[PDB]
Amino acid sequence: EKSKSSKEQKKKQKVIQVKEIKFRPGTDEGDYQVKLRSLIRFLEEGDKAKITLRFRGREMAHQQIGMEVLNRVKDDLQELAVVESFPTKIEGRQMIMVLAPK
Amino acid sequence: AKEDNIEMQGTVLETLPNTMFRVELENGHVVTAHISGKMRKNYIRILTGDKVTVELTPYDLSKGRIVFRS
RNA sequence: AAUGUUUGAAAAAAA
RNA sequence: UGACGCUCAGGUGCGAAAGCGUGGGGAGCAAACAGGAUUAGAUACCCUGGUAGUCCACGCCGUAAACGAUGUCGACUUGGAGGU
Ligand SMILES: NC(=O)OC[C@@H](O)C[C@H](NC(=O)[C@H]1NCCC[C@H]1O)C(=O)N[C@@H](Cc1c[nH]cn1)C(=O)N[C@H](C(=O)O)[C@H](O)c1c[nH]c(Cl)n1
Ligand SMILES: [K+]
Ligand SMILES: [K+]
Ligand SMILES: [Mg+2]
Ligand SMILES: [Mg+2]
Ligand SMILES: [Mg+2]
Ligand SMILES: [Mg+2]
Ligand SMILES: [Mg+2]
Ligand SMILES: [Mg+2]
Ligand SMILES: [Mg+2]
């Protein structure tokens, strides 16, 4: 009971984890708001937020509709987060936007 | 012997429950279309953004039947 | 143990 | 003793736990809550704490899968094995 009472303050150094919220193209407004409120909670507390958008089947045709959702979350969390990386192509069947705390 | 329909192209703007769709047509009018029976039976999926042929009726220009998806 | 392709209408099945 | 019985709408009382009011009490436990995890998320399950409450008095509440899911009273109608 000596080194721990120093290493407690060294442990207090907050460990920023990435919190994954997955959207879809079809995601409705009410459910979008839940997921947005989840993202707000993370970015409020100084946690990074990976934001996937998954396509299924022939939704791969209409990619831009997926991009609208990812664009929208960026806009809603414009003053509460910065875009660490915005996606370009569908890697696999996903587009990942990692946000960061301000 | 039956009365004739009006075929017209349109984009699916949103999907609704139970194979119902909003479809903005060529002329710019948004109709609440439903899937054809033949497309239901043969399992042709329709999605938001898909270009669809829509059979309209003169009795109602707010409704249609999606008969083809391109 | 949110699990384990898409197509189908004018003719599909993982390969 | 000598039919004084049976049932009973309305009525009256009793009625687990939670809960409510007032005043006590408070070891353990523990809604809420706080922190730690888990996870795609985890407003949970898991971990460390923890307040009301759980306890007492008095008053209130009048509900439960308040179940034998079987109203009360009386008579009659083969058997077998147990318990008290
Ligand atoms: N988190 C999420 O969104 O999904 C992950 C979740 O599906 C994990 C999964 N969880 C469970 O079954 C729960 N059972 C009840 C007790 C708690 C928990 O355990 C699970 O497999 N657990 C493991 C332990 C674990 C948690 N995170 C990673 N691993 C586990 O050992 N589960 C046991 C089981 O499935 O039989 C059992 O439930 C158990 C014993 N001890 C604990 Cl703790 N859990
Ligand atoms: K009476
Ligand atoms: K307490
Ligand atoms: Mg009686
Ligand atoms: Mg009580
Ligand atoms: Mg009290
Ligand atoms: Mg405890
Ligand atoms: Mg606990
Ligand atoms: Mg009742
Ligand atoms: Mg009953």
PDB file of all heavy atoms in Angstrom, chain D residues 7 17-18 24 29 32 34 49 54 62 71 80-81 84:
ATOM      1  P     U D   7     -74.599 -22.250   5.819  1.00  0.00           P
ATOM      2  OP1   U D   7     -73.192 -22.687   5.598  1.00  0.00           O
ATOM      3  OP2   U D   7     -74.876 -21.425   7.031  1.00  0.00           O
ATOM      4  O5'   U D   7     -75.022 -21.415   4.521  1.00  0.00           O
ATOM      5  C5'   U D   7     -75.168 -22.095   3.252  1.00  0.00           C
ATOM      6  C4'   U D   7     -75.920 -21.221   2.269  1.00  0.00           C
ATOM      7  O4'   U D   7     -77.341 -21.224   2.586  1.00  0.00           O
ATOM      8  C3'   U D   7     -75.534 -19.735   2.226  1.00  0.00           C
ATOM      9  O3'   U D   7     -74.461 -19.521   1.331  1.00  0.00           O
ATOM     10  C2'   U D   7     -76.820 -19.091   1.700  1.00  0.00           C
ATOM     11  O2'   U D   7     -76.960 -19.174   0.297  1.00  0.00           O
ATOM     12  C1'   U D   7     -77.882 -19.930   2.406  1.00  0.00           C
ATOM     13  N1    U D   7     -78.257 -19.331   3.720  1.00  0.00           N
ATOM     14  C2    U D   7     -79.222 -18.331   3.701  1.00  0.00           C
ATOM     15  O2    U D   7     -79.814 -18.003   2.685  1.00  0.00           O
ATOM     16  N3    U D   7     -79.495 -17.757   4.921  1.00  0.00           N
ATOM     17  C4    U D   7     -78.891 -18.044   6.132  1.00  0.00           C
ATOM     18  O4    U D   7     -79.245 -17.444   7.146  1.00  0.00           O
ATOM     19  C5    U D   7     -77.878 -19.063   6.069  1.00  0.00           C
ATOM     20  C6    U D   7     -77.598 -19.649   4.891  1.00  0.00           C
ATOM     21  P     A D  17     -46.929  -8.887   4.831  1.00  0.00           P
ATOM     22  OP1   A D  17     -45.770  -9.146   5.735  1.00  0.00           O
ATOM     23  OP2   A D  17     -47.913  -7.846   5.235  1.00  0.00           O
ATOM     24  O5'   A D  17     -46.372  -8.468   3.394  1.00  0.00           O
ATOM     25  C5'   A D  17     -45.249  -9.188   2.835  1.00  0.00           C
ATOM     26  C4'   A D  17     -44.955  -8.682   1.444  1.00  0.00           C
ATOM     27  O4'   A D  17     -46.068  -8.983   0.565  1.00  0.00           O
ATOM     28  C3'   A D  17     -44.759  -7.178   1.272  1.00  0.00           C
ATOM     29  O3'   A D  17     -43.457  -6.757   1.619  1.00  0.00           O
ATOM     30  C2'   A D  17     -45.008  -7.040  -0.228  1.00  0.00           C
ATOM     31  O2'   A D  17     -43.928  -7.474  -1.027  1.00  0.00           O
ATOM     32  C1'   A D  17     -46.204  -7.964  -0.407  1.00  0.00           C
ATOM     33  N9    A D  17     -47.486  -7.285  -0.229  1.00  0.00           N
ATOM     34  C8    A D  17     -48.257  -7.237   0.908  1.00  0.00           C
ATOM     35  N7    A D  17     -49.358  -6.548   0.763  1.00  0.00           N
ATOM     36  C5    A D  17     -49.310  -6.094  -0.543  1.00  0.00           C
ATOM     37  C6    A D  17     -50.199  -5.304  -1.303  1.00  0.00           C
ATOM     38  N6    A D  17     -51.339  -4.817  -0.827  1.00  0.00           N
ATOM     39  N1    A D  17     -49.852  -5.031  -2.588  1.00  0.00           N
ATOM     40  C2    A D  17     -48.695  -5.527  -3.058  1.00  0.00           C
ATOM     41  N3    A D  17     -47.789  -6.279  -2.436  1.00  0.00           N
ATOM     42  C4    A D  17     -48.156  -6.534  -1.166  1.00  0.00           C
ATOM     43  P     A D  18     -43.172  -5.255   2.104  1.00  0.00           P
ATOM     44  OP1   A D  18     -41.721  -5.060   2.359  1.00  0.00           O
ATOM     45  OP2   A D  18     -44.133  -4.871   3.174  1.00  0.00           O
ATOM     46  O5'   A D  18     -43.531  -4.431   0.785  1.00  0.00           O
ATOM     47  C5'   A D  18     -42.616  -4.443  -0.320  1.00  0.00           C
ATOM     48  C4'   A D  18     -43.248  -3.770  -1.514  1.00  0.00           C
ATOM     49  O4'   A D  18     -44.541  -4.361  -1.796  1.00  0.00           O
ATOM     50  C3'   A D  18     -43.548  -2.282  -1.374  1.00  0.00           C
ATOM     51  O3'   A D  18     -42.397  -1.502  -1.629  1.00  0.00           O
ATOM     52  C2'   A D  18     -44.626  -2.106  -2.438  1.00  0.00           C
ATOM     53  O2'   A D  18     -44.126  -2.054  -3.754  1.00  0.00           O
ATOM     54  C1'   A D  18     -45.450  -3.364  -2.212  1.00  0.00           C
ATOM     55  N9    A D  18     -46.488  -3.194  -1.195  1.00  0.00           N
ATOM     56  C8    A D  18     -46.439  -3.573   0.124  1.00  0.00           C
ATOM     57  N7    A D  18     -47.514  -3.271   0.799  1.00  0.00           N
ATOM     58  C5    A D  18     -48.328  -2.638  -0.123  1.00  0.00           C
ATOM     59  C6    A D  18     -49.620  -2.079  -0.017  1.00  0.00           C
ATOM     60  N6    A D  18     -50.322  -2.066   1.110  1.00  0.00           N
ATOM     61  N1    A D  18     -50.148  -1.513  -1.129  1.00  0.00           N
ATOM     62  C2    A D  18     -49.422  -1.518  -2.257  1.00  0.00           C
ATOM     63  N3    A D  18     -48.207  -2.017  -2.475  1.00  0.00           N
ATOM     64  C4    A D  18     -47.704  -2.571  -1.355  1.00  0.00           C
ATOM     65  P     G D  24     -38.732  11.554  15.918  1.00  0.00           P
ATOM     66  OP1   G D  24     -38.076  12.567  16.796  1.00  0.00           O
ATOM     67  OP2   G D  24     -38.250  11.423  14.512  1.00  0.00           O
ATOM     68  O5'   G D  24     -38.653  10.140  16.664  1.00  0.00           O
ATOM     69  C5'   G D  24     -37.730   9.132  16.182  1.00  0.00           C
ATOM     70  C4'   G D  24     -37.962   7.843  16.930  1.00  0.00           C
ATOM     71  O4'   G D  24     -39.184   7.224  16.449  1.00  0.00           O
ATOM     72  C3'   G D  24     -36.884   6.769  16.762  1.00  0.00           C
ATOM     73  O3'   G D  24     -35.845   6.924  17.724  1.00  0.00           O
ATOM     74  C2'   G D  24     -37.692   5.489  16.971  1.00  0.00           C
ATOM     75  O2'   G D  24     -37.926   5.209  18.335  1.00  0.00           O
ATOM     76  C1'   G D  24     -38.982   5.844  16.237  1.00  0.00           C
ATOM     77  N9    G D  24     -38.930   5.580  14.801  1.00  0.00           N
ATOM     78  C8    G D  24     -38.951   6.495  13.776  1.00  0.00           C
ATOM     79  N7    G D  24     -38.877   5.949  12.587  1.00  0.00           N
ATOM     80  C5    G D  24     -38.798   4.587  12.840  1.00  0.00           C
ATOM     81  C6    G D  24     -38.716   3.494  11.939  1.00  0.00           C
ATOM     82  O6    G D  24     -38.674   3.525  10.701  1.00  0.00           O
ATOM     83  N1    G D  24     -38.664   2.271  12.615  1.00  0.00           N
ATOM     84  C2    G D  24     -38.685   2.121  13.984  1.00  0.00           C
ATOM     85  N2    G D  24     -38.637   0.867  14.462  1.00  0.00           N
ATOM     86  N3    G D  24     -38.785   3.147  14.834  1.00  0.00           N
ATOM     87  C4    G D  24     -38.835   4.345  14.198  1.00  0.00           C
ATOM     88  P     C D  29     -25.221  -7.513   3.296  1.00  0.00           P
ATOM     89  OP1   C D  29     -24.440  -8.424   2.408  1.00  0.00           O
ATOM     90  OP2   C D  29     -24.841  -6.071   3.355  1.00  0.00           O
ATOM     91  O5'   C D  29     -26.746  -7.589   2.856  1.00  0.00           O
ATOM     92  C5'   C D  29     -27.275  -8.816   2.349  1.00  0.00           C
ATOM     93  C4'   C D  29     -28.725  -8.604   2.003  1.00  0.00           C
ATOM     94  O4'   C D  29     -29.414  -7.995   3.124  1.00  0.00           O
ATOM     95  C3'   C D  29     -29.005  -7.645   0.844  1.00  0.00           C
ATOM     96  O3'   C D  29     -28.840  -8.314  -0.395  1.00  0.00           O
ATOM     97  C2'   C D  29     -30.460  -7.261   1.130  1.00  0.00           C
ATOM     98  O2'   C D  29     -31.388  -8.263   0.773  1.00  0.00           O
ATOM     99  C1'   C D  29     -30.428  -7.133   2.654  1.00  0.00           C
ATOM    100  N1    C D  29     -30.159  -5.738   3.109  1.00  0.00           N
ATOM    101  C2    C D  29     -31.235  -4.844   3.145  1.00  0.00           C
ATOM    102  O2    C D  29     -32.356  -5.242   2.789  1.00  0.00           O
ATOM    103  N3    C D  29     -31.023  -3.570   3.562  1.00  0.00           N
ATOM    104  C4    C D  29     -29.803  -3.171   3.944  1.00  0.00           C
ATOM    105  N4    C D  29     -29.657  -1.918   4.358  1.00  0.00           N
ATOM    106  C5    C D  29     -28.694  -4.061   3.904  1.00  0.00           C
ATOM    107  C6    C D  29     -28.914  -5.321   3.487  1.00  0.00           C
ATOM    108  P     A D  32     -33.156  -0.199  -9.922  1.00  0.00           P
ATOM    109  OP1   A D  32     -33.528  -0.328 -11.359  1.00  0.00           O
ATOM    110  OP2   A D  32     -31.819  -0.700  -9.495  1.00  0.00           O
ATOM    111  O5'   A D  32     -33.176   1.345  -9.523  1.00  0.00           O
ATOM    112  C5'   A D  32     -34.334   2.128  -9.881  1.00  0.00           C
ATOM    113  C4'   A D  32     -34.319   3.430  -9.125  1.00  0.00           C
ATOM    114  O4'   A D  32     -34.283   3.183  -7.699  1.00  0.00           O
ATOM    115  C3'   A D  32     -33.124   4.344  -9.353  1.00  0.00           C
ATOM    116  O3'   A D  32     -33.232   5.032 -10.588  1.00  0.00           O
ATOM    117  C2'   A D  32     -33.274   5.273  -8.151  1.00  0.00           C
ATOM    118  O2'   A D  32     -34.277   6.249  -8.323  1.00  0.00           O
ATOM    119  C1'   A D  32     -33.640   4.267  -7.057  1.00  0.00           C
ATOM    120  N9    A D  32     -32.468   3.789  -6.334  1.00  0.00           N
ATOM    121  C8    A D  32     -31.825   2.583  -6.474  1.00  0.00           C
ATOM    122  N7    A D  32     -30.760   2.474  -5.723  1.00  0.00           N
ATOM    123  C5    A D  32     -30.672   3.687  -5.063  1.00  0.00           C
ATOM    124  C6    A D  32     -29.750   4.196  -4.123  1.00  0.00           C
ATOM    125  N6    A D  32     -28.712   3.505  -3.659  1.00  0.00           N
ATOM    126  N1    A D  32     -29.955   5.455  -3.658  1.00  0.00           N
ATOM    127  C2    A D  32     -31.009   6.143  -4.124  1.00  0.00           C
ATOM    128  N3    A D  32     -31.939   5.766  -5.004  1.00  0.00           N
ATOM    129  C4    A D  32     -31.715   4.513  -5.441  1.00  0.00           C
ATOM    130  P     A D  34     -26.874   7.939 -11.544  1.00  0.00           P
ATOM    131  OP1   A D  34     -26.660   9.276 -12.169  1.00  0.00           O
ATOM    132  OP2   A D  34     -27.211   6.788 -12.431  1.00  0.00           O
ATOM    133  O5'   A D  34     -25.579   7.567 -10.690  1.00  0.00           O
ATOM    134  C5'   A D  34     -25.027   8.565  -9.800  1.00  0.00           C
ATOM    135  C4'   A D  34     -23.790   8.021  -9.128  1.00  0.00           C
ATOM    136  O4'   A D  34     -24.159   7.020  -8.144  1.00  0.00           O
ATOM    137  C3'   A D  34     -22.787   7.284 -10.015  1.00  0.00           C
ATOM    138  O3'   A D  34     -21.989   8.164 -10.798  1.00  0.00           O
ATOM    139  C2'   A D  34     -21.991   6.541  -8.945  1.00  0.00           C
ATOM    140  O2'   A D  34     -21.088   7.375  -8.251  1.00  0.00           O
ATOM    141  C1'   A D  34     -23.123   6.061  -8.040  1.00  0.00           C
ATOM    142  N9    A D  34     -23.641   4.749  -8.416  1.00  0.00           N
ATOM    143  C8    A D  34     -24.729   4.467  -9.207  1.00  0.00           C
ATOM    144  N7    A D  34     -24.939   3.186  -9.372  1.00  0.00           N
ATOM    145  C5    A D  34     -23.916   2.577  -8.660  1.00  0.00           C
ATOM    146  C6    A D  34     -23.589   1.223  -8.436  1.00  0.00           C
ATOM    147  N6    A D  34     -24.280   0.200  -8.937  1.00  0.00           N
ATOM    148  N1    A D  34     -22.494   0.963  -7.678  1.00  0.00           N
ATOM    149  C2    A D  34     -21.794   1.996  -7.184  1.00  0.00           C
ATOM    150  N3    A D  34     -22.019   3.302  -7.312  1.00  0.00           N
ATOM    151  C4    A D  34     -23.102   3.533  -8.077  1.00  0.00           C
ATOM    152  P     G D  49     -18.287  -4.152  -1.094  1.00  0.00           P
ATOM    153  OP1   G D  49     -17.406  -4.424   0.079  1.00  0.00           O
ATOM    154  OP2   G D  49     -19.562  -4.919  -1.215  1.00  0.00           O
ATOM    155  O5'   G D  49     -18.555  -2.577  -1.137  1.00  0.00           O
ATOM    156  C5'   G D  49     -19.861  -2.061  -0.787  1.00  0.00           C
ATOM    157  C4'   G D  49     -19.932  -0.615  -1.200  1.00  0.00           C
ATOM    158  O4'   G D  49     -20.013  -0.545  -2.645  1.00  0.00           O
ATOM    159  C3'   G D  49     -21.142   0.175  -0.703  1.00  0.00           C
ATOM    160  O3'   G D  49     -20.892   0.735   0.579  1.00  0.00           O
ATOM    161  C2'   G D  49     -21.268   1.249  -1.784  1.00  0.00           C
ATOM    162  O2'   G D  49     -20.361   2.312  -1.594  1.00  0.00           O
ATOM    163  C1'   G D  49     -20.930   0.450  -3.040  1.00  0.00           C
ATOM    164  N9    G D  49     -22.084  -0.183  -3.674  1.00  0.00           N
ATOM    165  C8    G D  49     -22.344  -1.525  -3.821  1.00  0.00           C
ATOM    166  N7    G D  49     -23.460  -1.773  -4.468  1.00  0.00           N
ATOM    167  C5    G D  49     -23.958  -0.516  -4.783  1.00  0.00           C
ATOM    168  C6    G D  49     -25.139  -0.144  -5.479  1.00  0.00           C
ATOM    169  O6    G D  49     -26.003  -0.886  -5.969  1.00  0.00           O
ATOM    170  N1    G D  49     -25.265   1.249  -5.569  1.00  0.00           N
ATOM    171  C2    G D  49     -24.367   2.161  -5.056  1.00  0.00           C
ATOM    172  N2    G D  49     -24.639   3.463  -5.234  1.00  0.00           N
ATOM    173  N3    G D  49     -23.261   1.811  -4.401  1.00  0.00           N
ATOM    174  C4    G D  49     -23.119   0.469  -4.300  1.00  0.00           C
ATOM    175  P     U D  54     -41.329  -0.568   5.315  1.00  0.00           P
ATOM    176  OP1   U D  54     -42.754  -1.013   5.344  1.00  0.00           O
ATOM    177  OP2   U D  54     -40.845   0.366   6.373  1.00  0.00           O
ATOM    178  O5'   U D  54     -40.435  -1.892   5.339  1.00  0.00           O
ATOM    179  C5'   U D  54     -40.841  -3.034   4.537  1.00  0.00           C
ATOM    180  C4'   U D  54     -39.776  -4.102   4.608  1.00  0.00           C
ATOM    181  O4'   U D  54     -38.523  -3.576   4.110  1.00  0.00           O
ATOM    182  C3'   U D  54     -39.434  -4.631   6.005  1.00  0.00           C
ATOM    183  O3'   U D  54     -40.339  -5.661   6.380  1.00  0.00           O
ATOM    184  C2'   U D  54     -38.027  -5.188   5.787  1.00  0.00           C
ATOM    185  O2'   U D  54     -38.042  -6.470   5.190  1.00  0.00           O
ATOM    186  C1'   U D  54     -37.445  -4.178   4.794  1.00  0.00           C
ATOM    187  N1    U D  54     -36.641  -3.132   5.461  1.00  0.00           N
ATOM    188  C2    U D  54     -35.282  -3.367   5.583  1.00  0.00           C
ATOM    189  O2    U D  54     -34.739  -4.378   5.156  1.00  0.00           O
ATOM    190  N3    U D  54     -34.577  -2.377   6.219  1.00  0.00           N
ATOM    191  C4    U D  54     -35.079  -1.199   6.735  1.00  0.00           C
ATOM    192  O4    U D  54     -34.314  -0.402   7.277  1.00  0.00           O
ATOM    193  C5    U D  54     -36.493  -1.029   6.578  1.00  0.00           C
ATOM    194  C6    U D  54     -37.212  -1.988   5.973  1.00  0.00           C
ATOM    195  P     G D  62     -58.444   1.414  -1.392  1.00  0.00           P
ATOM    196  OP1   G D  62     -58.591   1.828  -2.812  1.00  0.00           O
ATOM    197  OP2   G D  62     -59.513   1.781  -0.420  1.00  0.00           O
ATOM    198  O5'   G D  62     -58.297  -0.169  -1.313  1.00  0.00           O
ATOM    199  C5'   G D  62     -57.492  -0.852  -2.300  1.00  0.00           C
ATOM    200  C4'   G D  62     -57.466  -2.316  -1.958  1.00  0.00           C
ATOM    201  O4'   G D  62     -56.953  -2.468  -0.608  1.00  0.00           O
ATOM    202  C3'   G D  62     -58.829  -3.026  -1.958  1.00  0.00           C
ATOM    203  O3'   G D  62     -58.657  -4.336  -2.454  1.00  0.00           O
ATOM    204  C2'   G D  62     -59.205  -3.017  -0.474  1.00  0.00           C
ATOM    205  O2'   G D  62     -60.141  -4.014  -0.139  1.00  0.00           O
ATOM    206  C1'   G D  62     -57.833  -3.272   0.135  1.00  0.00           C
ATOM    207  N9    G D  62     -57.699  -2.921   1.541  1.00  0.00           N
ATOM    208  C8    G D  62     -58.237  -1.838   2.191  1.00  0.00           C
ATOM    209  N7    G D  62     -57.913  -1.778   3.459  1.00  0.00           N
ATOM    210  C5    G D  62     -57.097  -2.885   3.657  1.00  0.00           C
ATOM    211  C6    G D  62     -56.459  -3.354   4.836  1.00  0.00           C
ATOM    212  O6    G D  62     -56.470  -2.849   5.964  1.00  0.00           O
ATOM    213  N1    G D  62     -55.716  -4.512   4.594  1.00  0.00           N
ATOM    214  C2    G D  62     -55.626  -5.156   3.380  1.00  0.00           C
ATOM    215  N2    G D  62     -54.863  -6.257   3.330  1.00  0.00           N
ATOM    216  N3    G D  62     -56.237  -4.727   2.273  1.00  0.00           N
ATOM    217  C4    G D  62     -56.937  -3.583   2.477  1.00  0.00           C
ATOM    218  P     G D  71     -66.293 -23.979  -6.312  1.00  0.00           P
ATOM    219  OP1   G D  71     -67.403 -24.966  -6.435  1.00  0.00           O
ATOM    220  OP2   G D  71     -66.312 -22.770  -7.185  1.00  0.00           O
ATOM    221  O5'   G D  71     -66.221 -23.564  -4.775  1.00  0.00           O
ATOM    222  C5'   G D  71     -65.614 -22.311  -4.393  1.00  0.00           C
ATOM    223  C4'   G D  71     -66.564 -21.547  -3.501  1.00  0.00           C
ATOM    224  O4'   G D  71     -67.664 -21.032  -4.291  1.00  0.00           O
ATOM    225  C3'   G D  71     -67.270 -22.341  -2.403  1.00  0.00           C
ATOM    226  O3'   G D  71     -66.411 -22.563  -1.295  1.00  0.00           O
ATOM    227  C2'   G D  71     -68.426 -21.396  -2.082  1.00  0.00           C
ATOM    228  O2'   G D  71     -68.014 -20.310  -1.275  1.00  0.00           O
ATOM    229  C1'   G D  71     -68.823 -20.938  -3.487  1.00  0.00           C
ATOM    230  N9    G D  71     -69.880 -21.733  -4.095  1.00  0.00           N
ATOM    231  C8    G D  71     -69.776 -22.588  -5.163  1.00  0.00           C
ATOM    232  N7    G D  71     -70.917 -23.147  -5.498  1.00  0.00           N
ATOM    233  C5    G D  71     -71.838 -22.595  -4.617  1.00  0.00           C
ATOM    234  C6    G D  71     -73.238 -22.807  -4.501  1.00  0.00           C
ATOM    235  O6    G D  71     -73.964 -23.556  -5.176  1.00  0.00           O
ATOM    236  N1    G D  71     -73.784 -22.075  -3.446  1.00  0.00           N
ATOM    237  C2    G D  71     -73.087 -21.225  -2.630  1.00  0.00           C
ATOM    238  N2    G D  71     -73.788 -20.584  -1.682  1.00  0.00           N
ATOM    239  N3    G D  71     -71.772 -21.004  -2.745  1.00  0.00           N
ATOM    240  C4    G D  71     -71.212 -21.727  -3.747  1.00  0.00           C
ATOM    241  P     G D  80     -60.471 -52.159   0.830  1.00  0.00           P
ATOM    242  OP1   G D  80     -60.350 -53.465   1.539  1.00  0.00           O
ATOM    243  OP2   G D  80     -60.905 -50.968   1.616  1.00  0.00           O
ATOM    244  O5'   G D  80     -59.061 -51.807   0.170  1.00  0.00           O
ATOM    245  C5'   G D  80     -58.434 -52.792  -0.687  1.00  0.00           C
ATOM    246  C4'   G D  80     -57.154 -52.233  -1.253  1.00  0.00           C
ATOM    247  O4'   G D  80     -57.447 -51.168  -2.194  1.00  0.00           O
ATOM    248  C3'   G D  80     -56.196 -51.569  -0.267  1.00  0.00           C
ATOM    249  O3'   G D  80     -55.493 -52.515   0.526  1.00  0.00           O
ATOM    250  C2'   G D  80     -55.319 -50.794  -1.250  1.00  0.00           C
ATOM    251  O2'   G D  80     -54.421 -51.614  -1.968  1.00  0.00           O
ATOM    252  C1'   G D  80     -56.394 -50.221  -2.174  1.00  0.00           C
ATOM    253  N9    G D  80     -56.900 -48.931  -1.718  1.00  0.00           N
ATOM    254  C8    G D  80     -58.084 -48.668  -1.074  1.00  0.00           C
ATOM    255  N7    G D  80     -58.223 -47.408  -0.739  1.00  0.00           N
ATOM    256  C5    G D  80     -57.057 -46.802  -1.186  1.00  0.00           C
ATOM    257  C6    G D  80     -56.648 -45.444  -1.123  1.00  0.00           C
ATOM    258  O6    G D  80     -57.258 -44.484  -0.633  1.00  0.00           O
ATOM    259  N1    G D  80     -55.383 -45.259  -1.690  1.00  0.00           N
ATOM    260  C2    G D  80     -54.618 -46.255  -2.258  1.00  0.00           C
ATOM    261  N2    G D  80     -53.423 -45.903  -2.756  1.00  0.00           N
ATOM    262  N3    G D  80     -55.010 -47.528  -2.334  1.00  0.00           N
ATOM    263  C4    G D  80     -56.230 -47.729  -1.781  1.00  0.00           C
ATOM    264  P     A D  81     -55.016 -52.158   2.020  1.00  0.00           P
ATOM    265  OP1   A D  81     -54.419 -53.365   2.661  1.00  0.00           O
ATOM    266  OP2   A D  81     -56.068 -51.413   2.768  1.00  0.00           O
ATOM    267  O5'   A D  81     -53.853 -51.121   1.682  1.00  0.00           O
ATOM    268  C5'   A D  81     -52.685 -51.589   0.973  1.00  0.00           C
ATOM    269  C4'   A D  81     -51.718 -50.446   0.799  1.00  0.00           C
ATOM    270  O4'   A D  81     -52.302 -49.432  -0.058  1.00  0.00           O
ATOM    271  C3'   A D  81     -51.345 -49.683   2.066  1.00  0.00           C
ATOM    272  O3'   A D  81     -50.365 -50.394   2.811  1.00  0.00           O
ATOM    273  C2'   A D  81     -50.839 -48.367   1.472  1.00  0.00           C
ATOM    274  O2'   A D  81     -49.508 -48.450   1.009  1.00  0.00           O
ATOM    275  C1'   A D  81     -51.830 -48.154   0.324  1.00  0.00           C
ATOM    276  N9    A D  81     -52.963 -47.311   0.698  1.00  0.00           N
ATOM    277  C8    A D  81     -54.233 -47.713   1.035  1.00  0.00           C
ATOM    278  N7    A D  81     -55.018 -46.722   1.377  1.00  0.00           N
ATOM    279  C5    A D  81     -54.220 -45.593   1.263  1.00  0.00           C
ATOM    280  C6    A D  81     -54.480 -44.220   1.464  1.00  0.00           C
ATOM    281  N6    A D  81     -55.658 -43.743   1.857  1.00  0.00           N
ATOM    282  N1    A D  81     -53.453 -43.352   1.273  1.00  0.00           N
ATOM    283  C2    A D  81     -52.266 -43.841   0.884  1.00  0.00           C
ATOM    284  N3    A D  81     -51.914 -45.105   0.647  1.00  0.00           N
ATOM    285  C4    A D  81     -52.947 -45.944   0.851  1.00  0.00           C
ATOM    286  P     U D  84     -47.144 -40.474  11.419  1.00  0.00           P
ATOM    287  OP1   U D  84     -45.847 -40.062  12.030  1.00  0.00           O
ATOM    288  OP2   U D  84     -47.701 -41.816  11.756  1.00  0.00           O
ATOM    289  O5'   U D  84     -48.231 -39.388  11.839  1.00  0.00           O
ATOM    290  C5'   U D  84     -47.907 -37.989  11.714  1.00  0.00           C
ATOM    291  C4'   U D  84     -49.130 -37.172  12.043  1.00  0.00           C
ATOM    292  O4'   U D  84     -50.179 -37.440  11.081  1.00  0.00           O
ATOM    293  C3'   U D  84     -49.792 -37.462  13.388  1.00  0.00           C
ATOM    294  O3'   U D  84     -49.116 -36.791  14.435  1.00  0.00           O
ATOM    295  C2'   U D  84     -51.200 -36.918  13.154  1.00  0.00           C
ATOM    296  O2'   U D  84     -51.255 -35.510  13.250  1.00  0.00           O
ATOM    297  C1'   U D  84     -51.441 -37.368  11.714  1.00  0.00           C
ATOM    298  N1    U D  84     -52.122 -38.688  11.616  1.00  0.00           N
ATOM    299  C2    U D  84     -53.492 -38.704  11.822  1.00  0.00           C
ATOM    300  O2    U D  84     -54.132 -37.698  12.109  1.00  0.00           O
ATOM    301  N3    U D  84     -54.092 -39.936  11.679  1.00  0.00           N
ATOM    302  C4    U D  84     -53.470 -41.134  11.369  1.00  0.00           C
ATOM    303  O4    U D  84     -54.143 -42.163  11.270  1.00  0.00           O
ATOM    304  C5    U D  84     -52.053 -41.035  11.162  1.00  0.00           C
ATOM    305  C6    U D  84     -51.441 -39.844  11.297  1.00  0.00           C
TER     306        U D  84
END
